Amino acid sequence: RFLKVKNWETDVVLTDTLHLKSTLETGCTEHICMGSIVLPVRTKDQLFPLAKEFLDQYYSSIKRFGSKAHMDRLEEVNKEIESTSTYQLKDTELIYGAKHAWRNASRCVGRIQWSKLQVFDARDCTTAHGMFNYICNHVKYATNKGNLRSAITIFPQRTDGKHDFRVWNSQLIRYAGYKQPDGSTLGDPANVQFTEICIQQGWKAPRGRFDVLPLLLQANGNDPELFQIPPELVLEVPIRHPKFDWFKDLGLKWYGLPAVSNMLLEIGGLEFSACPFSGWYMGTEIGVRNYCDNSRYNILEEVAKKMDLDMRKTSSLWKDQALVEINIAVLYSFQSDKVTIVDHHSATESFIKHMENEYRCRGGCPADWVWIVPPMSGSITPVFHQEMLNYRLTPSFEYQPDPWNTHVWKG
Amino acid sequence: RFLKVKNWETDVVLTDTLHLKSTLETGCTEHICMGSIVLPTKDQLFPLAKEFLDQYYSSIKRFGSKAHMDRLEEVNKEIESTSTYQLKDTELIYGAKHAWRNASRCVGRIQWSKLQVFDARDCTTAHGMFNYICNHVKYATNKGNLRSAITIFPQRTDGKHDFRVWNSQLIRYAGYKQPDGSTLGDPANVQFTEICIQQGWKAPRGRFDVLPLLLQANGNDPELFQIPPELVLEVPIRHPKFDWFKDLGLKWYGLPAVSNMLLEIGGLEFSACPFSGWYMGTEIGVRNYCDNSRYNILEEVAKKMDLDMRKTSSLWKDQALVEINIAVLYSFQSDKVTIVDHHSATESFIKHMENEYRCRGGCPADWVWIVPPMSGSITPVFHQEMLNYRLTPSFEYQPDPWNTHVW
Ligand code: HEM
Ligand code: HEM
Ligand SMILES: Cc1cc(N)nc(CCc2cc(N)cc(CCc3cc(C)cc(N)n3)c2)c1
Ligand SMILES: Cc1cc(N)nc(CCc2cc(N)cc(CCc3cc(C)cc(N)n3)c2)c1
Ligand SMILES: [Cl-]
Numbered sequence: 180r181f182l183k184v185k186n187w188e189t190d191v192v193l194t195d196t197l198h199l200k201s202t203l204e205t206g207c208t209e210h211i212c213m214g215s216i217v218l219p220v221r222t223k224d225q226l227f228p229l230a231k232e233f234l235d236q237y238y239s240s241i242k243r244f245g246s247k248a249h250m251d252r253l254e255e256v257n258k259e260i261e262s263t264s265t266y267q268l269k270d271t272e273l274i275y276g277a278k279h280a281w282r283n284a285s286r287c288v289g290r291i292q293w294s295k296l297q298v299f300d301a302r303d304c305t306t307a308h309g310m311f312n313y314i315c316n317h318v319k320y321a322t323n324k325g326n327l328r329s330a331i332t333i334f335p336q337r338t339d340g341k342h343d344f345r346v347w348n349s350q351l352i353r354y355a356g357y358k359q360p361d362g363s364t365l366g367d368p369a370n371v372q373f374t375e376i377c378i379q380q381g382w383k384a385p386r387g388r389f390d391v392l393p394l395l396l397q398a399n400g401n402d403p404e405l406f407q408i409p410p411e412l413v414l415e416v417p418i419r420h421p422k423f424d425w426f427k428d429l430g431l432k433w434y435g436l437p438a439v440s441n442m443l444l445e446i447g448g449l450e451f452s453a454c455p456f457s458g459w460y461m462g463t464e465i466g467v468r469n470y471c472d473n474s475r476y477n478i479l480e481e482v483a484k485k486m487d488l489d490m491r492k493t494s495s496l497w498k499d500q501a502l503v504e505i506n507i508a509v510l511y512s513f514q515s516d517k518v519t520i521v522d523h524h525s526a527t528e529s530f531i532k533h534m535e536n537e538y539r540c541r542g543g544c545p546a547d548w549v550w551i552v553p554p555m556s557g558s559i560t561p562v563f564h565q566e567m568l569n570y571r572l573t574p575s576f577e578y579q580p581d582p583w584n585t586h587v588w589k590g
Numbered sequence: 591r592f593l594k595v596k597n598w599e600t601d602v603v604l605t606d607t608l609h610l611k612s613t614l615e616t617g618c619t620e621h622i623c624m625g626s627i628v629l630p631t632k633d634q635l636f637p638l639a640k641e642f643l644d645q646y647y648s649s650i651k652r653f654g655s656k657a658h659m660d661r662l663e664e665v666n667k668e669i670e671s672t673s674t675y676q677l678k679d680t681e682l683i684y685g686a687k688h689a690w691r692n693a694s695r696c697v698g699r700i701q702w703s704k705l706q707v708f709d710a711r712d713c714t715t716a717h718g719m720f721n722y723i724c725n726h727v728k729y730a731t732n733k734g735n736l737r738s739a740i741t742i743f744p745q746r747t748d749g750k751h752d753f754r755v756w757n758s759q760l761i762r763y764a765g766y767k768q769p770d771g772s773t774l775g776d777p778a779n780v781q782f783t784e785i786c787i788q789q790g791w792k793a794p795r796g797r798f799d800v801l802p803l804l805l806q807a808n809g810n811d812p813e814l815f816q817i818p819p820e821l822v823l824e825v826p827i828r829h830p831k832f833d834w835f836k837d838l839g840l841k842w843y844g845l846p847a848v849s850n851m852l853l854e855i856g857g858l859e860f861s862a863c864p865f866s867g868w869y870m871g872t873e874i875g876v877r878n879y880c881d882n883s884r885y886n887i888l889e890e891v892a893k894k895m896d897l898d899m900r901k902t903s904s905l906w907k908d909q910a911l912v913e914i915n916i917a918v919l920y921s922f923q924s925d926k927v928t929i930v931d932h933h934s935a936t937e938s939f940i941k942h943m944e945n946e947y948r949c950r951g952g953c954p955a956d957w958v959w960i961v962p963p964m965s966g967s968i969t970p971v972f973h974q975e976m977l978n979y980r981l982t983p984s985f986e987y988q989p990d991p992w993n994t995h996v997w
């Protein structure tokens with residue numbers, strides 16, 4: 180079966196066949212679409228087909244499907260599963276797997292870059308101190324003095340589910356949030372709960388607006404431990420505006436390296452519960468979401484006020500005007516300090532090119548429109564009018580519960 | 591079988607029970623989400639009729655009453671004998687209001703129950719259709735103080751006697767391909783414009799030529815009619831800060847009136863059912879003016895503002911976009927023509943949605959269409975999870991009649 184998507188701006192029609200290789204579930208049924216819902220120990224038995232499906236894909240990609248080396252590897256994995264209940268990936272399979280999880284990441288507009296991922300294999304890691312060292316190296320390598328490079332660091336896989344490696348931080352680098360007695364928040368409200376955990380664990384909180392959180396690292400199912408990322412490794416950019424001289428006096432800065440550390444990487448049935456990965460920012464992630472969400476730094480009012488906009492009626496589009504100026508400021512600051520950043524026009528244009536190429540060469544490109552369309556100016560970017568098909572290919576990145584809800588403490 | 595939606599800005603969580611009444615298909619499967627796709631017998635009729643009449647009698651607190659039973663019997667009898675049935679006026683008004691209520695892509699539904707329904711089931715000719723439409727337009731326009739309305743033509747019978755309004759909206763501007771290679775007017779209407787020329791229309795060949803109505807009664811060949819110009823309220827577009835904005839020569843019409851959809855009530859199919867409300871500002875300023883395949887004026891506006899168009903990262907497209915939208919809202923307000931901005935419209939919808947959750951147990955909504963085409967994230971709908979499903983009565987797409995019609 181073939182599925183058609185249409186672009187309503189250009190009338191270009193593409194044909195998807197890759198959806199036939201789809202696996203997991205969307206949450207949707209013929210009766211209900213869950214397209215806008217944010218989130219809607221394995222047996223030997225369920226594991227070998229998963230392994231096989233993965234290794235069949237791996238060996239096709241290297242043009243060795245059905246080769247002696249292919250069968251030998253299937254047999255080797257099969258026996259290892261039977262006698263040990265799990266199996267180890269070759270380095271080459273791991274690299275390929277992490278790259279494909281990104282390639283398959285339907286919410287990611289940045290996928291044109293998928294093949295250039297630097298994979299750091301941390302499967303020899305055994306302690307939280309080991310994790311900390313691996314994470315510092317990742318940070319330094321990815322940052323590259325502002326010339327950012329994609330990377331992922333992969334810690335040992337789940338075994339019985341009692342010995343998990345986890346990074347408790349949702350991102351490697353993020354700012355503390357502190358709820359005050361008066362009900363206000365200092366710093367980033369997204370991180371209040373995790374900040375409190377850190378404090379409870381012994382972190383001495385500076386209690387400022389932009390305090391870099393410490394890492395909270397769990398190795399081998401042990402209790403997690405606190406570590407400070409060396410400050411010289413944390414690249415940050417003061418935010419200023421090219422024409423508004425008062426913008427700098429807002430006191431804003433952001434970190435250059437977005438590094439997601441709470442997701443789970445699934446390859447060939449194996450579960451990597453600590454697999455921090457990083458790229459670089461699209462400007463609206465900072466300018467629209469991090470600054471302008473009401474549940475975040477919430478700076479729209481303060482900026483529009485300084486701009487002396489008419490704020491008595493929403494219909495002046497004062498919020499829209501301020502939003503734009505803030506995003507201009509974020510891009511200007513990054514570019515001036517020579518830190519890699521991408522504007523939403525540029526990122527979406529790239530993504531459409533990526534997507535068309537994927538249809539030709541791969542037979543599809545699963546994509547979640549709700550996430551792909553940028554959070555401002557949606558319609559004047561080339562993704563808005565692009566029909567997309569969302570489905571789940573493995574290898575993949577998945578959500579997992581926050582470890583503070585599931586962890587068994589030892590003391 | 592009891593579904594939760596979260597708002598990620600407020601943490602508020604809501605429970606949907608209304609979806610277990612969902613009926614038609616989404617296009618999606620367990621394996622694949624088609625959420626961003628724009629278009630994904632007597633035996634048939636009676637269950638549909640019964641399903642409808644049951645919800646009607648439930649709504650007027652009369653479920654399982656004699657009058658409920660007898661109506662079900664009456665309709666059953668009429669289907670057996672006639673192969674169809676006629677709605678009571680009360681059923682028609684409820685069906686129409688509920689079709690709007692159930693429109694999952696419409697942000698403006700807080701108004702659903704105030705719809706003014708014009709029953710045009712006695713219409714027999716295209717001239718009749720024209721009279722009914724002019725009346726609808728004048729009533730809805732109301733000298734700028736817009737009121738929602740629908741006008742309902744006779745229902746489908748055998749499918750070779752369909753009433754259709756061939757236009758997509760009652761009021762729209764002509765589209766012309768020029769020897770130049772380019773497009774004068776609205777590129778969205780190029781094809782339909784040629785059908786007008788082909789059927790005899792004297793096109794003025796301007797940028798904002800209000801198209802003639804092209805009407806099909808009783809499955810007959812369609813006919814041309816021009817709406818009285820004094821009934822088409824238009825608004826010149828100016829900016830409250832930029833004096834030069836007027837010289838772009840821009841105007842838009844005040845009345846948005848979708849005329850190409852099909853209204854399904856209790857299995858009955860109303861192929862001609864133009865309905866109208868009033869504009870959300872972004873519809874004109876973002877879509878109609880700024881889509882590349884529409885009036886596409888972004889480049890021109892940015893030039894006038896003297897922005898640096900050398901690189902995308904100056905956000906010149908975004909600056910111009912905002913300004914254009916400010917000017918649309920300003921111009922409509924100054925001429926006292928109803929219009930809503932996207933902040934106001936989405937806040938109203940969030941109020942409505944919560945109302946529907948507590949009183950009806952749910953509100954089908956399609957996030958892809960509900961989130962405005964600019965500044966999505968700073969409106970309260972962006973962070974609102976929504977459930978999309980099909981309830982009946984409904985509005986449905988139907989194919990363009992020139993592909994269907996035989997002469
Ligand atoms: C290199 C430049 C990259 C850019 C510009 C980029 C951009 C984005 C954006 C903008 C989003 C979510 C929409 C939003 O935040 O507004 C996103 C989501 C995501 N990205 Fe990428 N990304 C990049 C690299 C990567 C890498 C290296 C990976 C993994 C190896 C990755 C995996 C993901 C995943 C799994 C999501 C969905 C997250 C979730 O569901 O919460 N991205 N990306
Ligand atoms: C009263 C003011 C109204 C407002 C502000 C409004 C707003 C909107 C908007 C903004 C959209 C599409 C999203 C976009 O254009 O960006 C839409 C779609 C729609 N509206 Fe409403 N509307 C109104 C009245 C009505 C009425 C009176 C009806 C029917 C009685 C209706 C039925 C629909 C339907 C069926 C769609 C989807 C059209 C399609 O799928 O192509 N609306 N509305
Ligand atoms: C590796 C990488 C690089 C890069 N540049 N950006 C990312 C994504 C990071 C991200 C982090 C958070 N906290 C939230 C979102 C979207 C939150 C969201 C989006 C939508 C569309 C709806 C909703 N409710 N929430 C995305 C990853
Ligand atoms: C009665 C009524 C009142 C009112 N104020 N507005 C309307 C909507 C009319 C409308 C007409 C057209 N041609 C296109 C769209 C959206 C086109 C669109 C939206 C999205 C989200 C994606 C896509 N591809 N196309 C909407 C109806
Ligand atoms: Cl972020």
Ligand SMILES: [Cl-]
Pocket residue numbers: 468472
């Ligand atoms: Cl968000």
Ligand SMILES: [Cl-]
Pocket residue numbers: 846873878
């Ligand atoms: Cl329109």
Ligand SMILES: [Cl-]
Pocket residue numbers: 877881
């Ligand atoms: Cl559109």
Ligand SMILES: [Zn+2]
Pocket residue numbers: 207208211212213214618622623624625
């Ligand atoms: Zn779906």
Ligand SMILES: [Zn+2]
Pocket residue numbers: 468472967973
């Ligand atoms: Zn947000």
Ligand SMILES: [Zn+2]
Pocket residue numbers: 558564877881
């Ligand atoms: Zn558009």
